[PDB]
Protein backbone atom coordinates (compact mmCIF):
# COMPACT_ATOMS: atom_id res chain seq x y z
CA UNK A 1 0.00 0.00 0.00
CA UNK A 2 3.18 2.71 1.49
CA UNK A 3 5.96 0.34 -0.98
CA UNK A 4 9.27 0.90 0.71
CA UNK A 5 12.24 0.68 -1.23
CA UNK A 6 15.41 0.18 0.63
CA UNK A 7 19.00 0.52 -0.77
CA UNK A 8 21.71 -0.72 -1.51
CA UNK A 9 20.41 -4.16 -1.22
CA UNK A 10 24.37 -4.92 -0.26
CA UNK A 11 27.00 -3.32 1.57
CA UNK A 12 30.31 -4.46 2.76
CA UNK A 13 32.05 -2.42 4.83
CA UNK A 14 35.37 -2.19 7.38
CA UNK A 15 35.10 -2.11 11.50
CA UNK A 16 35.95 1.54 11.86
CA UNK A 17 33.80 3.00 8.73
CA UNK A 18 30.90 5.13 8.26
CA UNK A 19 28.39 4.10 6.28
CA UNK A 20 24.41 5.55 5.26
CA UNK A 21 21.42 3.13 4.23
CA UNK A 22 18.26 4.78 2.38
CA UNK A 23 15.05 3.83 2.27
CA UNK A 24 12.27 5.86 -0.03
CA UNK A 25 8.11 5.26 0.18
CA UNK A 26 6.33 5.79 -2.49
CA UNK A 27 4.29 8.36 -0.75
CA UNK A 28 5.25 10.82 2.17
CA UNK A 29 4.80 8.48 5.60
CA UNK A 30 5.39 12.05 7.59
CA UNK A 31 8.28 11.17 10.13
CA UNK A 32 7.08 7.63 10.48
CA UNK A 33 10.13 5.61 9.71
CA UNK A 34 11.50 2.61 12.03
CA UNK A 35 14.65 0.77 11.43
CA UNK A 36 15.62 -3.13 12.60
CA UNK A 37 18.06 -5.20 12.72
CA UNK A 38 18.26 -8.87 11.82
CA UNK A 39 20.65 -11.53 12.82
CA UNK A 40 20.57 -15.55 12.48
CA UNK A 41 19.49 -17.09 15.80
CA UNK A 42 18.31 -14.12 17.25
CA UNK A 43 15.41 -12.05 17.61
CA UNK A 44 14.47 -8.83 15.71
CA UNK A 45 15.68 -5.49 17.24
CA UNK A 46 14.13 -2.01 17.07
CA UNK A 47 17.13 0.55 16.42
CA UNK A 48 14.95 3.75 15.65
CA UNK A 49 11.27 5.03 15.69
CA UNK A 50 9.42 8.29 14.32
CA UNK A 51 12.75 8.76 11.64
CA UNK A 52 14.85 9.48 14.03
CA UNK A 53 14.25 8.49 17.61
CA UNK A 54 16.81 6.14 19.08
CA UNK A 55 15.28 2.95 20.74
CA UNK A 56 16.43 2.72 24.42
CA UNK A 57 19.51 0.83 24.76
CA UNK A 58 20.35 1.64 20.81
CA UNK A 59 24.25 2.89 20.81
CA UNK A 60 24.89 6.28 19.84
CA UNK A 61 26.48 5.89 16.83
CA UNK A 62 23.30 5.04 15.02
CA UNK A 63 21.33 7.89 13.54
CA UNK A 64 18.02 8.54 11.42
CA UNK A 65 16.94 11.51 9.38
CA UNK A 66 14.89 12.35 6.99
CA UNK A 67 10.71 13.14 6.80
CA UNK A 68 8.15 12.49 3.56
CA UNK A 69 9.51 9.94 1.46
CA UNK A 70 12.84 9.94 1.78
CA UNK A 71 14.79 8.60 5.15
CA UNK A 72 18.41 7.49 6.20
CA UNK A 73 20.03 5.45 8.73
CA UNK A 74 24.01 6.44 9.45
CA UNK A 75 25.82 4.49 12.05
CA UNK A 76 29.31 5.69 12.49
CA UNK A 77 32.20 3.68 12.98
CA UNK A 78 31.23 0.12 13.09
CA UNK A 79 31.60 -1.99 15.53
CA UNK A 80 31.92 -6.40 14.54
CA UNK A 81 28.05 -6.61 15.94
CA UNK A 82 26.66 -3.98 13.79
CA UNK A 83 26.95 -6.14 10.70
CA UNK A 84 23.54 -7.84 10.18
CA UNK A 85 20.85 -7.20 7.63
CA UNK A 86 18.37 -3.85 8.57
CA UNK A 87 14.96 -3.31 7.24
CA UNK A 88 13.21 -0.24 7.44
CA UNK A 89 9.00 0.05 8.22
CA UNK A 90 6.41 2.87 7.77
CA UNK A 91 4.58 3.31 10.76
CA UNK A 92 2.36 5.93 9.83
CA UNK A 93 -0.64 3.85 8.34
CA UNK A 94 -2.24 0.51 8.25
CA UNK A 95 -1.41 -1.96 6.50
CA UNK A 96 2.63 -1.17 8.11
CA UNK A 97 4.86 -2.37 5.20
CA UNK A 98 8.67 -2.70 5.32
CA UNK A 99 11.49 -2.72 3.14
CA UNK A 100 12.58 -5.72 1.43
CA UNK A 101 16.22 -5.03 3.59
CA UNK A 102 20.17 -3.99 3.39
CA UNK A 103 22.69 -6.80 3.87
CA UNK A 104 25.80 -5.02 5.92
CA UNK A 105 28.62 -6.99 5.32
CA UNK A 106 32.03 -7.47 7.15
CA UNK A 107 35.02 -6.61 5.09
CA UNK A 108 37.71 -9.26 5.57
CA UNK A 109 40.64 -9.77 3.72
CA UNK A 110 40.61 -11.49 0.33
CA UNK A 111 40.66 -15.67 0.76
CA UNK A 112 40.46 -18.75 -1.38
CA UNK A 113 38.30 -21.53 -1.35
CA UNK A 114 39.52 -25.03 -0.08
CA UNK A 115 37.68 -27.26 -2.47
CA UNK A 116 36.76 -30.97 -1.60
CA UNK A 117 35.34 -33.35 -4.33
CA UNK A 118 32.72 -36.14 -3.78
CA UNK A 119 31.86 -39.37 -5.71
CA UNK A 120 28.57 -41.06 -5.71
CA UNK A 121 28.36 -42.92 -2.25
CA UNK A 122 27.61 -46.83 -2.86
CA UNK A 123 24.64 -46.33 -0.87
CA UNK A 124 23.09 -43.32 -3.28
CA UNK A 125 24.21 -45.66 -6.17
CA UNK A 126 22.42 -48.38 -4.94
CA UNK A 127 19.09 -46.52 -4.78
CA UNK A 128 19.46 -45.70 -8.72
CA UNK A 129 20.87 -41.93 -8.36
CA UNK A 130 24.61 -40.74 -8.85
CA UNK A 131 25.45 -37.17 -6.91
CA UNK A 132 28.77 -35.26 -7.27
CA UNK A 133 29.31 -33.01 -4.71
CA UNK A 134 32.02 -30.40 -4.44
CA UNK A 135 32.49 -28.14 -0.90
CA UNK A 136 33.77 -24.65 -1.48
CA UNK A 137 34.67 -23.71 1.94
CA UNK A 138 36.15 -20.46 3.85
CA UNK A 139 36.14 -17.90 1.04
CA UNK A 140 35.93 -14.47 0.55
CA UNK A 141 34.54 -12.26 -1.04
CA UNK A 142 30.88 -14.81 -1.71
CA UNK A 143 31.07 -14.40 -5.31
CA UNK A 144 32.70 -17.37 -7.44
CA UNK A 145 31.99 -19.41 -10.19
CA UNK A 146 32.28 -23.17 -9.92
CA UNK A 147 32.04 -25.34 -13.12
CA UNK A 148 31.04 -28.74 -13.76
CA UNK A 149 33.28 -30.74 -16.34
CA UNK A 150 32.28 -34.46 -17.38
CA UNK A 151 35.57 -36.14 -19.43
CA UNK A 152 36.39 -32.41 -20.29
CA UNK A 153 33.05 -31.03 -21.29
CA UNK A 154 31.13 -28.69 -19.51
CA UNK A 155 28.51 -29.74 -17.98
CA UNK A 156 25.26 -27.26 -17.60
CA UNK A 157 21.90 -28.74 -16.08
CA UNK A 158 21.62 -30.45 -13.13
CA UNK A 159 23.71 -28.16 -10.72
CA UNK A 160 22.92 -26.92 -7.47
CA UNK A 161 24.64 -24.46 -5.44
CA UNK A 162 24.14 -23.31 -2.03
CA UNK A 163 25.78 -20.88 0.27
CA UNK A 164 26.35 -20.33 3.97
CA UNK A 165 25.55 -16.95 5.86
CA UNK A 166 29.09 -15.23 6.16
CA UNK A 167 30.22 -16.36 9.41
CA UNK A 168 30.70 -14.58 12.68
CA UNK A 169 33.94 -15.64 13.53
CA UNK A 170 36.26 -15.53 10.11
CA UNK A 171 33.67 -13.36 8.19
CA UNK A 172 34.32 -16.35 5.45
CA UNK A 173 31.65 -17.99 3.33
CA UNK A 174 31.39 -21.55 2.19
CA UNK A 175 29.21 -23.37 -0.63
CA UNK A 176 28.17 -26.25 -2.01
CA UNK A 177 28.26 -27.71 -5.49
CA UNK A 178 25.92 -30.70 -6.66
CA UNK A 179 25.33 -32.15 -9.91
CA UNK A 180 22.96 -34.44 -9.78
CA UNK A 181 22.48 -37.48 -12.39
CA UNK A 182 21.06 -40.87 -12.88
CA UNK A 183 23.15 -44.01 -12.64
CA UNK A 184 23.15 -44.75 -15.66
CA UNK A 185 24.12 -41.43 -17.06
CA UNK A 186 26.57 -41.57 -14.08
CA UNK A 187 28.59 -44.21 -15.44
CA UNK A 188 28.75 -43.09 -19.48
CA UNK A 189 31.63 -41.26 -18.16
CA UNK A 190 34.84 -41.52 -16.83
CA UNK A 191 35.92 -38.07 -15.30
CA UNK A 192 34.34 -35.13 -13.37
CA UNK A 193 35.52 -32.06 -12.48
CA UNK A 194 34.48 -29.16 -10.22
CA UNK A 195 36.27 -25.80 -11.50
CA UNK A 196 36.22 -23.13 -9.07
CA UNK A 197 37.18 -19.44 -10.09
CA UNK A 198 37.40 -16.54 -7.47
CA UNK A 199 38.94 -13.21 -7.80
CA UNK A 200 42.05 -14.22 -5.63
CA UNK A 201 43.86 -15.99 -8.39
CA UNK A 202 42.89 -16.05 -12.47
CA UNK A 203 43.93 -19.56 -12.36
CA UNK A 204 40.79 -21.73 -11.34
CA UNK A 205 41.02 -24.74 -8.28
CA UNK A 206 40.08 -28.01 -9.78
CA UNK A 207 39.28 -30.86 -7.96
CA UNK A 208 38.79 -34.58 -10.35
CA UNK A 209 38.45 -37.91 -9.85
CA UNK A 210 38.15 -40.81 -12.64
CA UNK A 211 35.30 -43.35 -12.19
CA UNK A 212 37.49 -45.40 -13.22
CA UNK A 213 40.84 -44.95 -11.42
CA UNK A 214 38.62 -46.72 -8.91
CA UNK B 1 13.39 -10.12 30.70
CA UNK B 2 10.51 -10.03 28.15
CA UNK B 3 10.24 -13.46 26.03
CA UNK B 4 7.50 -13.92 23.54
CA UNK B 5 7.56 -17.60 22.12
CA UNK B 6 5.94 -18.74 18.97
CA UNK B 7 4.30 -22.14 18.43
CA UNK B 8 1.53 -24.38 16.61
CA UNK B 9 4.04 -24.20 13.17
CA UNK B 10 3.68 -27.14 10.91
CA UNK B 11 2.71 -28.85 7.91
CA UNK B 12 -0.93 -28.55 6.14
CA UNK B 13 -2.62 -29.14 2.85
CA UNK B 14 -4.66 -26.22 0.77
CA UNK B 15 -7.25 -25.42 2.18
CA UNK B 16 -6.51 -26.59 5.64
CA UNK B 17 -6.30 -24.78 8.91
CA UNK B 18 -3.70 -24.40 11.67
CA UNK B 19 -3.91 -22.02 14.93
CA UNK B 20 -0.42 -20.40 16.17
CA UNK B 21 -0.10 -18.97 19.75
CA UNK B 22 2.55 -16.73 21.05
CA UNK B 23 3.23 -16.95 25.07
CA UNK B 24 4.21 -13.87 26.01
CA UNK B 25 6.05 -13.06 29.35
CA UNK B 26 8.04 -10.01 30.87
CA UNK B 27 5.79 -7.42 30.93
CA UNK B 28 1.90 -6.09 31.48
CA UNK B 29 0.20 -8.00 28.32
CA UNK B 30 -2.81 -6.10 28.63
CA UNK B 31 -1.07 -2.76 27.70
CA UNK B 32 0.75 -3.40 24.65
CA UNK B 33 -0.26 -3.89 21.21
CA UNK B 34 0.46 -7.56 19.94
CA UNK B 35 1.41 -8.85 16.27
CA UNK B 36 1.69 -11.05 13.75
CA UNK B 37 4.44 -10.64 10.75
CA UNK B 38 5.43 -13.23 8.32
CA UNK B 39 8.60 -13.30 6.33
CA UNK B 40 7.83 -15.87 3.08
CA UNK B 41 11.19 -17.26 1.93
CA UNK B 42 13.14 -14.79 0.05
CA UNK B 43 10.90 -11.88 0.61
CA UNK B 44 10.16 -8.81 2.82
CA UNK B 45 8.57 -8.76 6.46
CA UNK B 46 4.63 -8.67 5.76
CA UNK B 47 2.82 -7.21 8.52
CA UNK B 48 -0.68 -9.34 8.94
CA UNK B 49 -2.47 -8.35 11.83
CA UNK B 50 -2.69 -6.43 15.00
CA UNK B 51 -4.55 -6.50 18.48
CA UNK B 52 -4.67 -3.42 20.44
CA UNK B 53 -4.34 -3.19 24.15
CA UNK B 54 -7.08 -2.94 27.07
CA UNK B 55 -6.98 0.91 27.01
CA UNK B 56 -8.53 0.50 23.20
CA UNK B 57 -11.08 -2.66 23.77
CA UNK B 58 -8.37 -5.25 22.19
CA UNK B 59 -9.97 -3.68 18.59
CA UNK B 60 -8.33 -5.35 15.60
CA UNK B 61 -6.76 -4.48 12.15
CA UNK B 62 -6.21 -6.84 9.19
CA UNK B 63 -3.89 -7.12 6.10
CA UNK B 64 -5.85 -7.06 2.95
CA UNK B 65 -4.56 -10.64 2.09
CA UNK B 66 -5.63 -12.52 5.19
CA UNK B 67 -8.55 -10.39 5.88
CA UNK B 68 -11.50 -13.06 6.56
CA UNK B 69 -9.19 -16.12 6.88
CA UNK B 70 -7.40 -15.06 9.95
CA UNK B 71 -8.30 -13.76 13.15
CA UNK B 72 -5.95 -12.87 15.53
CA UNK B 73 -7.07 -12.91 19.31
CA UNK B 74 -5.48 -12.89 23.10
CA UNK B 75 -5.95 -14.71 26.10
CA UNK B 76 -5.24 -12.02 28.48
CA UNK B 77 -5.10 -13.88 31.62
CA UNK B 78 -2.86 -16.24 30.38
CA UNK B 79 -0.63 -13.43 28.55
CA UNK B 80 -1.28 -15.82 25.43
CA UNK B 81 -1.71 -14.04 21.67
CA UNK B 82 -3.66 -16.52 18.85
CA UNK B 83 -3.53 -16.51 14.94
CA UNK B 84 -6.39 -18.36 14.04
CA UNK B 85 -5.71 -18.94 10.09
CA UNK B 86 -8.44 -21.26 8.03
CA UNK B 87 -8.26 -21.66 4.42
CA UNK B 88 -4.81 -21.50 3.94
CA UNK B 89 -2.90 -21.32 0.77
CA UNK B 90 0.27 -22.45 -0.29
CA UNK B 91 1.83 -18.70 -0.55
CA UNK B 92 0.55 -18.56 2.83
CA UNK B 93 4.03 -20.57 4.09
CA UNK B 94 6.63 -18.33 5.85
CA UNK B 95 7.89 -18.02 9.59
CA UNK B 96 5.52 -16.37 11.49
CA UNK B 97 6.51 -13.92 14.38
CA UNK B 98 4.52 -12.30 17.27
CA UNK B 99 5.63 -9.04 18.31
CA UNK B 100 4.99 -6.38 20.77
CA UNK B 101 5.18 -2.10 20.38
CA UNK B 102 7.83 -0.28 22.17
CA UNK B 103 5.16 1.47 23.87
CA UNK B 104 5.89 5.16 22.78
CA UNK B 105 5.26 4.79 19.25
CA UNK B 106 2.27 1.03 18.95
CA UNK B 107 2.78 0.62 15.35
CA UNK B 108 6.51 -0.17 15.71
CA UNK B 109 7.66 -3.76 17.16
CA UNK B 110 10.51 -3.58 20.29
CA UNK B 111 9.98 -7.70 20.76
CA UNK B 112 9.52 -10.38 18.21
CA UNK B 113 9.97 -14.09 18.73
CA UNK B 114 12.02 -16.39 17.10
CA UNK B 115 8.97 -17.57 15.25
CA UNK B 116 7.51 -20.49 14.12
CA UNK B 117 7.40 -22.12 10.42
CA UNK B 118 4.00 -22.75 8.26
CA UNK B 119 4.33 -24.98 5.29
CA UNK B 120 1.31 -25.42 3.53
CA UNK B 121 1.81 -27.97 0.37
CA UNK B 122 0.08 -31.02 -1.40
CA UNK B 123 3.83 -32.86 -0.36
CA UNK B 124 4.07 -35.23 2.32
CA UNK B 125 6.07 -35.64 5.03
CA UNK B 126 8.98 -38.09 4.10
CA UNK B 127 12.24 -39.04 5.86
CA UNK B 128 15.62 -38.11 4.35
CA UNK B 129 17.81 -40.78 2.62
CA UNK B 130 21.12 -39.95 4.19
CA UNK B 131 24.71 -40.09 2.31
CA UNK B 132 28.41 -40.60 3.20
CA UNK B 133 30.74 -38.08 1.70
CA UNK B 134 34.15 -39.70 1.98
CA UNK B 135 37.15 -38.85 0.23
CA UNK B 136 38.26 -41.67 -2.88
CA UNK B 137 41.07 -43.09 -4.10
CA UNK B 138 45.33 -36.57 1.07
CA UNK B 139 47.01 -33.95 3.69
CA UNK B 140 46.77 -32.65 7.16
CA UNK B 141 43.49 -31.82 7.35
CA UNK B 142 40.35 -33.70 5.85
CA UNK B 143 36.85 -32.72 4.78
CA UNK B 144 33.75 -35.16 5.17
CA UNK B 145 30.24 -34.77 5.00
CA UNK B 146 26.96 -36.35 4.97
CA UNK B 147 24.14 -35.38 1.58
CA UNK B 148 20.48 -35.26 2.85
CA UNK B 149 17.91 -35.50 0.07
CA UNK B 150 14.46 -36.64 0.04
CA UNK B 151 13.05 -35.07 3.02
CA UNK B 152 9.57 -33.03 3.52
CA UNK B 153 8.90 -30.46 5.49
CA UNK B 154 11.82 -29.06 6.62
CA UNK B 155 13.88 -28.89 8.83
CA UNK B 156 16.84 -31.35 9.51
CA UNK B 157 19.32 -31.26 12.11
CA UNK B 158 22.85 -32.67 11.55
CA UNK B 159 24.79 -33.41 15.00
CA UNK B 160 28.77 -34.50 13.99
CA UNK B 161 30.31 -36.68 16.97
CA UNK B 162 27.51 -35.50 19.74
CA UNK B 163 28.55 -31.82 18.94
CA UNK B 164 32.14 -32.10 19.45
CA UNK B 165 33.56 -30.83 16.05
CA UNK B 166 30.61 -28.19 15.46
CA UNK B 167 33.24 -25.59 15.57
CA UNK B 168 34.55 -26.44 11.56
CA UNK B 169 30.71 -27.91 10.78
CA UNK B 170 29.03 -25.70 7.45
CA UNK B 171 25.62 -26.71 7.02
CA UNK B 172 24.07 -25.84 4.00
CA UNK B 173 20.67 -24.57 3.52
CA UNK B 174 17.83 -26.90 1.86
CA UNK B 175 17.20 -26.35 -1.40
CA UNK B 176 14.02 -27.51 -3.22
CA UNK B 177 14.23 -30.40 -5.62
CA UNK B 178 11.47 -32.97 -7.32
CA UNK B 179 9.04 -31.53 -4.83
CA UNK B 180 11.60 -32.41 -1.79
CA UNK B 181 14.60 -31.02 0.12
CA UNK B 182 18.45 -31.84 -0.16
CA UNK B 183 20.67 -30.46 2.46
CA UNK B 184 24.41 -31.26 3.30
CA UNK B 185 26.75 -30.54 6.09
CA UNK B 186 30.53 -30.41 6.16
CA UNK B 187 33.17 -31.24 8.96
CA UNK B 188 36.79 -30.58 8.75
CA UNK B 189 38.97 -32.22 11.21
CA UNK B 190 42.63 -33.41 11.30
CA UNK B 191 43.89 -36.41 9.27
CA UNK B 192 45.84 -37.42 12.46
CA UNK B 193 41.77 -38.18 13.93
CA UNK B 194 39.85 -39.52 10.97
CA UNK B 195 39.99 -42.71 10.04
CA UNK B 196 42.01 -43.16 13.06
CA UNK B 197 38.74 -42.35 15.02
CA UNK B 198 35.07 -42.67 14.28
CA UNK B 199 33.75 -39.61 12.46
CA UNK B 200 29.59 -40.07 12.49
CA UNK B 201 26.97 -37.77 11.29
CA UNK B 202 23.30 -37.94 13.41
CA UNK B 203 20.39 -36.58 10.97
CA UNK B 204 17.51 -35.97 13.01
CA UNK B 205 13.77 -35.24 11.33
CA UNK B 206 11.50 -34.91 13.77
CA UNK B 207 8.49 -34.17 11.16
CA UNK B 208 8.91 -37.91 10.35
CA UNK B 209 10.65 -39.25 13.90
CA UNK B 210 13.06 -40.38 11.64
CA UNK B 211 17.03 -40.42 13.53
CA UNK B 212 19.47 -41.79 11.16
CA UNK B 213 23.22 -41.94 12.35
CA UNK B 214 25.81 -43.02 9.63
CA UNK B 215 29.79 -43.47 10.34
CA UNK B 216 31.61 -42.57 7.70
CA UNK B 217 34.16 -44.91 6.39
CA UNK B 218 37.88 -44.41 4.63
CA UNK B 219 38.24 -45.40 1.03
CA UNK B 220 37.96 -49.07 1.38
CA UNK B 221 37.07 -52.41 -0.80
CA UNK B 222 34.07 -53.50 -2.84
CA UNK B 223 34.10 -56.14 -0.94
CA UNK B 224 34.16 -56.92 2.50
NA1 LIG C 1 35.49 -21.81 -12.90
NA1 LIG D 1 2.42 -20.11 -3.79
ZN1 LIG E 1 32.45 -39.17 -21.96
Known amino acids: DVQITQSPSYLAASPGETITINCRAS??????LAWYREKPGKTNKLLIY???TLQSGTPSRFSGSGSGTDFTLTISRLEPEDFAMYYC?????????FGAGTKLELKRADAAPTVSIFPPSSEQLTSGGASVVCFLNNFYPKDINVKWKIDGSERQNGVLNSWTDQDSKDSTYSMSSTLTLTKDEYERHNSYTCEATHKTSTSPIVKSFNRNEC | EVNLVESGGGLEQSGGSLSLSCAAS????????MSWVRQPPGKALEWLAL??????????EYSASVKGRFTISRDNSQSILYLQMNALRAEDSAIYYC?????????????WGQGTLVTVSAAKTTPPSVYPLAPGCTGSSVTLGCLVKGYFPESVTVTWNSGSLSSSVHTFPALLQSGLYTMSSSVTVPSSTWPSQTVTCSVAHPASSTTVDKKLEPSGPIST
Open chain 1, 50 to 52: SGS
Open chain 1, 89 to 97: QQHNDYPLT
Open chain 1, 27 to 32: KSIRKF
Open chain 2, 51 to 60: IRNKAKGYTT
Open chain 2, 99 to 111: ARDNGAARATFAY
Open chain 2, 26 to 33: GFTFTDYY
